[PDB]
């Protein structure tokens, strides 16, 4: 159980302003069918340390690992999608 | 239903990847298939073209399995990039 305590915080800290917001949105979407928009208020304004503990709360154990890995996946696809969107059509 | 990712989604994103990104994708796939398929189909994947690669995932991971595995691989791929960034 190394991921919830130390791993997530390091990579989260590596994210810039745009990337961090992107993370929260996908998390919001992920928590939606299970918790609704109830914790979204907390998550949206949450700091990285608070965000890490929040995920430990709603997703304890390897649950944090499963959702986080998937969120990082969607984040990569977003960048790729945004990149492909300009190649497919040069008019954005 | 839905999640027709190998047929419509996956094929596009693989094409967005460069050579190194495609290889990195294959490596992570190898890691995932190992406890399930071993190194038996790894030979096929290693040499696989992007179009071939999509059908292979359609084969070994039918239904929404292809989307789930792909999403996790892209996650590790992103973590790799982030790791390399902090290391620099």
UniProtKB/Swiss-Prot annotation, chain A:
It is found in: Cytoplasm. Residues 1-90 form the Pyrin domain. Changing residue 77 to R: Increased thermal stability of the Pyrin domain. It comes from the Eukaryota. Testis-specific. May be involved in inflammation and spermatogenesis. Belongs to the NLRP family. Upon heterologous expression, a small proportion of the isolated Pyrin domain forms homodimers and higher oligomers. This is NACHT, LRR and PYD domains-containing protein 14. It comes from Homo sapiens (Human). The chain holds residues 8 to 99 of 1093 of the full protein.
């Amino acid at each position: 159980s190394f991921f919830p305590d130390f791993g997530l915080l390091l990579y989260l800290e590596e994210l810039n302003k745009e990337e961090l917001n992107t993370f929260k949105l996908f998390l919001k979407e992920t928590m939606e069918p299970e918790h609704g928009l109830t914790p979204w208020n907390e998550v949206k304004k949450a700091r990285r340390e608070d965000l890490a503990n929040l995920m430990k709360k709603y997703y304890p154990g390897e649950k944090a690992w499963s959702v986080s890995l998937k969120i990082f996946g969607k984040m990569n696809l977003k960048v790729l999608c945004e990149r492909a969107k300009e190649e497919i059509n040069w008019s954005a």
